[PDB]
Ligand binder design. Sequence first.
Ligand code: BCL
Ligand code: BCL
Ligand code: BCL
Ligand code: BCL
Ligand code: BCL
Ligand code: G2O
Ligand code: G2O
Ligand SMILES: CCCCCCCCCCCC(=O)OC[C@H]1O[C@H](OC(C)(C)CCC\C(C)=C/C=C/C(C)=C/C=C/C(C)=C/C=C/C=C(C)/C=C/C=C(C)/C=C/c2c(C)ccc(C)c2C)[C@H](O)[C@@H](O)[C@@H]1O
Ligand code: SF4
Ligand code: SF4
Ligand SMILES: [Ca+2]
Lengths: 101, 122, 647, 61, 358, 100
Amino acid sequence: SGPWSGNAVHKAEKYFITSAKRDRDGKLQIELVPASGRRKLSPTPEMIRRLIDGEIEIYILTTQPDIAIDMNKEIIDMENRYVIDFDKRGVKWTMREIPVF
Amino acid sequence: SNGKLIALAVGGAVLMGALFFSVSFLTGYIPAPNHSAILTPLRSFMGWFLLIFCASIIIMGLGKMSSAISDKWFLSFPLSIFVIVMVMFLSLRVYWEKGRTTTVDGKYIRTTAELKEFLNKP
Amino acid sequence: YQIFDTEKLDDEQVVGGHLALLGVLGFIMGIYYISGIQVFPWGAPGFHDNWFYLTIKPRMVSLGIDTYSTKTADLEAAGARLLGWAAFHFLVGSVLIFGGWRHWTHNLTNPFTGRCGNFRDFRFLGKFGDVVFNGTSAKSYKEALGPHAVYMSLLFLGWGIVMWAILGFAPIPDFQTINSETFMSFVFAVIFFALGIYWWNNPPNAAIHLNDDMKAAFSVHLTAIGYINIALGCIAFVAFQQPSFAPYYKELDKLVFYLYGEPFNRVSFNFVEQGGKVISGAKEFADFPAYAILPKSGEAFGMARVVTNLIVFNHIICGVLYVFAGVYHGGQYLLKIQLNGMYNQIKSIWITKGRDQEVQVKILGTVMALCFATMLSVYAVIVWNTICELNIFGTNITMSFYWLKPLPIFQWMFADPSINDWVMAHVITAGSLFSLIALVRIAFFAHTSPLWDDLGLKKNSYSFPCLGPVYGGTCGVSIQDQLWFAMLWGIKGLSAVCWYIDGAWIASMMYGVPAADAKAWDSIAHLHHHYTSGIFYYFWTETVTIFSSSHLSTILMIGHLVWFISFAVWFEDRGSRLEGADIQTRTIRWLGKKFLNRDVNFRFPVLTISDSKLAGTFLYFGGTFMLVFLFLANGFYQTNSPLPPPV
Amino acid sequence: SHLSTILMIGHLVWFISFAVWFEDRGSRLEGADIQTRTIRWLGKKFLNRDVNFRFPVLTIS
Amino acid sequence: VTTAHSDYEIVLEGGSSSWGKVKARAKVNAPPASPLLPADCDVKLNVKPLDPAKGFVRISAVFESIVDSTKNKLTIEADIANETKERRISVGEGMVSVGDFSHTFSFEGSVVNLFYYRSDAVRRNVPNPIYMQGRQFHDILMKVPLDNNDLIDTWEGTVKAIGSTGAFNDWIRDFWFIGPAFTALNEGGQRISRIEVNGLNTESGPKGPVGVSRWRFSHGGSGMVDSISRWAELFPSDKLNRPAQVEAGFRSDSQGIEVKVDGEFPGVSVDAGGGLRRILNHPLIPLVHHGMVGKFNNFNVDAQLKVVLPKGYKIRYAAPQYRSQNLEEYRWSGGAYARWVEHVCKGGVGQFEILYAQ
Amino acid sequence: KKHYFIIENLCVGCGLCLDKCPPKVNAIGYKFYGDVQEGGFRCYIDQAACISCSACFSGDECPSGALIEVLPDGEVLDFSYTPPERLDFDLRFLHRFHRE
Ligand code: BCL
Ligand code: BCL
Ligand code: BCL
Ligand code: BCL
Ligand code: BCL
Ligand code: G2O
Ligand code: G2O
Ligand SMILES: CCCCCCCCCCCC(=O)OC[C@H]1O[C@H](OC(C)(C)CCC\C(C)=C/C=C/C(C)=C/C=C/C(C)=C/C=C/C=C(C)/C=C/C=C(C)/C=C/c2c(C)ccc(C)c2C)[C@H](O)[C@@H](O)[C@@H]1O
Ligand code: SF4
Ligand code: SF4
Ligand SMILES: [Ca+2]
């Protein structure tokens, strides 16, 4: 009844930020995709509401075509913690395959 | 507030005692050649609790011993055991076994020869 | 160990497997029947007594197939009857295995006509299916329940006919004779006929099954049949001790049983087996041929209660194992449907009502709290009784719970109501609760546990030994591991059962001990039956007679070896064993090459942690209960003469 | 009597060794979570307004 | 023997939520260094996101303290926002009250904090830039209604002094750092520039005369000043998506000191690097300013820190190693942690690096 | 194409995916930070060594969801098939079976 819907390891359905392109120059190219991998969605205001409510969990991979660093709102005071907007928070999944043998 | 914790624990112990007493009255048993039916169930419940409580406090105290142990216990840990052991030995003489167990007369049976001479009373 | 999985097999394959196993079992029954032939039909002496036939001799003599009569005459007749029934079982088992092969291979072609019948569509027995079924179960186990009830009704009817005519027990209402078993055989026909008709016309529904459920239905029915076995064990214990069964179970004590492995007439070292053989040396007991298995009276051995205990504990162990296996296989099905996502799509209480993790946690917490309470109560009672009887801390037996008999409203269940029966009941409840902790963990926490849903982990493989030392250790968290822990926990309830039925005083660990007031229980508690010694001294008293038997001693040593071998796999040693086996491989390689030019190219295999746990639990259970068999097969050794006060 | 006490206590200790030596740390951890949750729920329900404490479990080492 | 019994607790939140329940009790038998005792105080700090679009958070601070025989109270309530990455704007009100005196105030000050070097060669080389040298300017416009007579008298005195004393701008410095403050300031690396009084005005309000003072000063930090170096880390207005609270207090007599603290606030956790989190770098101004009081008595510590990580998080490094672990709660008790507590209580600025990750 | 990866943030170092990797490929390896019980050990796929055989991910063996698959167009898959999302409620009947 909530742990048995979707993946049982994510209490909040997880959405990886797979593709984003600077060519369109609007950053609407940010194409969120759930871990299920069946809906190439976009960062709409409803997605913003879901993210702030905690229903969803947007995440970023390190090994990818770069999404947008400092072009999609970024906080670099600490280690980078990308944000769609300062109130939003895209927690970056770290992926150390190249640094280690 | 931990007052309710102790209240619940003591209430549970008291209820265990009362239930033991009530069922002892319910369970039809010949009390004993001498002992009563008012005190014996309470003696059994005392043993029951004292056992559970002693085990619980031993577990808890040893857990907090492992938690609080440090180098500062250098003299606190060993000497304490010393004293307790000392106390234990003294408790053997003054409380548990008060004497050397000589005969009623006091002949101090102390060799196997006199034990053989004794066990074969005429 | 997964070759005959439910998924790998279809319904017809299962039908054929069960049929072939029924045939194999009929062959086993014929083997036991022949093993029971004390005197051959040709006149010569026959087989000795085996537990395999001493377990069924009461029932066989109940049916007149065997006889407790002791003259060579009519024992030859009983042997001929047993041979005939064993031959009948042999041939019928051959036919059953033929049918099983046909169903397993799906070649359901009549050898005469060649018509290939369809498992999906088939008229049953010809016109009877038309009269009753009107056409088979097109599909579905639900539509099969009624037909199976009708089949069992026909089985009941056939047994009624067989006992009425073949075994000569007419149907009579009175329940003090085998005759009622004929009467009821007809009764339960109509019932299991009528109900079948009902379940044929009005099928039942539990939609979890019926769909992809050979494992699910198997799990439910295995748990059900395990409880059936437990109930049968209780019923067997009660009834076989009733007077009506005395002609068949209590008369064992009047017989003398020559059992394989029992004490054999010994011979001096200077013994020559020629002619009379007397001149060379002296045999142990004269009047019996050398090396002959000496008689053992059933009165001393208590063979009545020995056979009753063996049957009862067989059914209890089988039932507990079946309950555990049903919960395990149901957990496998639960995990499968959780992985594929059908769990939330099931619309039945047996799955939906425990869908919430909160209710699962509350259920398991209630079970754990009750287990803690009952275990603490019983263990405090037992240890206090031991403190008193051993007079530890200055105590004495007067402070023990001798007053704590079962209440007068519950003393009907117990012949001699004492603290022993109280501890038995509460220990059984506590062991049931303990094993239920693991069973409930299998039932609910099969794919995810509250710790694991918080820790962000999911149980997928249903056999994964662990997820590593993450979070301090994830050992033994699969449903298979919980099944193993459930078995190792039910070991204790099952022991309590054995020790209760073998006459032990389980209310204290040291009853009958020659120390302090341990022998005063009979006076203070006013017991009628002198219970066999207590939990720790029961080992000693029973081993007085286990040690007197070469066969039981061999079992003791072998089961003990098997038991302690289990730690090599259950202990957290797998990595050490793997490293050592790499060293073993290298040692074999270079040592062989130096000693012999031939190269090895072979590695010593090391069990995985999953297989390690599997084998370890198998060995633990095997040793423990192969030794419980010694406890139950030494003899009852519980006399009805209470021991006076020690002073 | 005293040797009997030692017998019983030594066997108790020895078999309690199996709770930790056996490959069961994950089971005990998953169950201690249930113990914690049961303590909180029961201490809130019939004991009133009290919830805390975690049941520790020994690591594999 | 002068024992010091302390108990600290830091419950965290998962994800990128830097929120933390910080509880802390302390009891020290050493006398406090206040020349007036007993000294009791209770401080509340409640901040709520008022207008997140413009980054405005309404922060209210209430101080209530009895010193000797006089009760004192300072309440403030200000909407503070990040105008830029280097400039912060505050519009607020408040009041002070000491015994038979009290006066309210309204202020519209602005704080511009800017470092001296923003080199990338340092940011890419040092992963933990503790010291950051900088200057923090304050342009403070504050208005006070002169309802009471003493307010008017002090306004007149200030008007006379500013318009006559050519060294007011620097002597005010040692005025408004009363007592040991002017010492501790210099002991924290903080410098204060000579203020500029842009104007004194008796711009009367609707209910009496109002003294309006606009003045600009600047405090400079050699890196040890957390109010400068950790500027962006002081103000988690971005993190503030719900009310944040702090309730602290201390009771001090010649017998000793007692301290209570209970807060729920963000900024406790910061990303060290590569998905690794860290309990924030310890501010150094509190430590160095405590060293001015903590070096006066020889004490033995009985301290116990309890870091309760979120469900599924593990500590990958702890400089003083943790004493015990309860599968989500890590306990520091005795050993090197006690040495570190004795080190910071006496003014130490040693590193206590807790790195944790999922 | 498939380009299977591991999220080092979520790996618990169980190694259930390592055993599936072909023996010679052995792309998946163990990286140790320290104090194994504290979770330092983790899993990494050397993308150079990986041959996109899908043995690691198709096994459905990752308990944490770290083992992910990036499709050729690009989409992260934490599992071969996640269960559908559901709006759940406890059906308690009114009169007969589970009242209230
Ligand atoms: C031990 C505790 C549990 C138990 C735990 C498990 C576990 C754990 C597993 C199964 C598995 C299976 N179990 Mg089970 N299961 C129990 C009771 C049962 C009973 C029953 C007696 O009613 C049945 C019908 C089943 C049925 C089944 C199948 C659905 C499945 C595959 C078995 C097979 O193909 O194995 C092939 C091997 C067998 C035939 C059994 C081994 C016996 C040998 C072959 C017998 C003859 C030789 C000799 C007499 C005895 C053996 C020792 C000798 C030294 C050679 N279980 C017991 C009580 N079961 C497996 C499965 O895949 O689950 C999905 C699995 O992993
Ligand atoms: C008494 C009624 C019991 C029951 C008792 C048994 C027993 C007992 C056994 C099975 C076996 C099987 N059961 Mg069943 N079974 C019941 C109800 C079901 C239902 C169902 C309700 O629809 C299903 C789907 C199954 C499913 C199955 C299959 C996994 C398997 C038959 C296939 C076959 O023979 O393979 C072809 C395999 C062969 C013929 C080789 C058999 C080898 C040897 C002779 C037997 C191996 C297992 C072991 C030694 C038996 C141990 C019994 C213990 C003494 C307790 N059971 C209920 C719960 N079933 C058998 C199996 O394979 O177990 C693993 C088996 O032995
Ligand atoms: C001991 C024998 C085995 C067995 C061995 C065989 C053999 C051998 C053959 C089949 C054939 C068939 N079996 Mg069969 N089969 C068994 C039990 C089953 C069961 C079941 C009730 O669970 C099912 C679903 C089936 C299914 C089927 C049918 C698809 C098919 C018959 C078609 C039909 O119209 O026949 C009408 C009758 C049937 C449905 C048979 C029902 C089973 C009976 C009990 C077989 C008894 C055989 C025995 C030698 C005679 C004793 C009769 C006494 C009255 C007891 N069998 C019995 C228990 N089965 C037959 C065939 O292909 O027929 C064309 C065939 O030659
Ligand atoms: C009662 C008759 C049968 C029974 C029939 C079934 C049926 C039918 C099904 C199961 C299923 C399951 N059974 Mg069962 N099962 C019984 C005995 C048990 C025992 C046991 C040791 O007593 C256990 C631990 C299990 C365990 C399990 C699980 C493997 C599985 C449910 C998982 C789940 O999510 O549940 C969620 C949790 C619950 C629903 C909890 C509430 C329990 C329900 C509502 C009924 C019993 C309680 C009853 C109302 C109590 C009060 C009155 C008393 C009767 C006097 N069964 C007995 C032998 N079991 C299902 C499965 O998937 O099989 C593979 C399934 O289809
Ligand atoms: C006007 C003052 C500034 C400001 C000045 C500072 C300074 C300076 C420091 C912090 C620090 C912190 N502040 Mg700030 N802070 C501001 C607004 C905020 C807001 C907000 C959104 O409004 C939030 C959520 C925070 C939260 C935080 C944390 C990021 C951090 C403490 C973490 C720790 O574990 O604390 C543990 C908390 C406790 C121990 C409780 C302490 C309670 C006492 C009552 C507060 C200190 C009082 C002081 C000793 C007396 C001064 C009285 C004045 C003379 C009137 N501040 C405002 C705008 N803040 C420190 C930090 O770590 O920086 C990186 C730091 O150096
Ligand atoms: C009869 C009981 C036992 C053995 C027999 C034995 C044998 C053995 N063991 Mg063992 N073991 C336990 C019992 C027995 N362990 C227990 C109860 C624990 C719980 C702690 C335990 C634990 C560990 C760990 C942790 C490690 C090992 C190993 C390791 C070996 C590899 C090489 C070696 O040691 O050879 C030295 C050992 C011998 C060759 C033993 C000689 C044979 C004998 C005289 C007769 C065999 C009798 C037979 C078992 C009965 C039935 C056989 C047939 C009829 C079906 C190896 C042959 C490990 C290695 O591979 O490293 C060396 C390793 O790491 N263990
Ligand atoms: C006397 C011996 C034992 C217990 C006492 C016990 C207690 C216990 N165990 Mg155990 N255990 C074995 C022996 C004992 N396991 C063996 C030989 C194996 C090898 C297979 C083994 C293995 C597993 C696995 C694999 C798991 C567990 C658990 C689990 C519990 C949590 C839930 C529960 O049962 O609460 C029900 C509450 C009770 C079981 C506690 C009542 C106490 C009573 C009055 C006996 C007192 C013992 C002694 C006198 C204390 C000394 C006091 C003083 C002198 C210093 C839990 C209280 C697991 C769970 O947490 O799952 C929910 C789990 O997964 N186990
Ligand atoms: C072996 C002795 C037990 C010790 C087991 C340890 C328990 C877990 C302890 C944690 C284990 C661990 O891992 O850590 C140890 C940690 O310890 C410390 O922390 C503390 C939390 C402070 C320890 C105190 C816990 C507690 C107060 C103590 C324990 C709890 C107590 C109170 C246990 C006893 C409870 C009771 C008595 C249970 C039983 C009660 C229920 C019963 C009997 C039901 C009666 C039935 C009724 C209603 C009627 C019956 C009826 C019926 C059915 C029919 C007919 C008729 C006629 C009738 C009468 C340090 O701080 C840490 O450093 C250290 O680590
Ligand atoms: S000790 Fe063995 S079973 Fe336990 S987590 Fe480590 S590898 Fe797995
Ligand atoms: S896809 Fe195949 S080769 Fe690549 S990491 Fe997975 S198992 Fe190894
Ligand atoms: Ca016996």
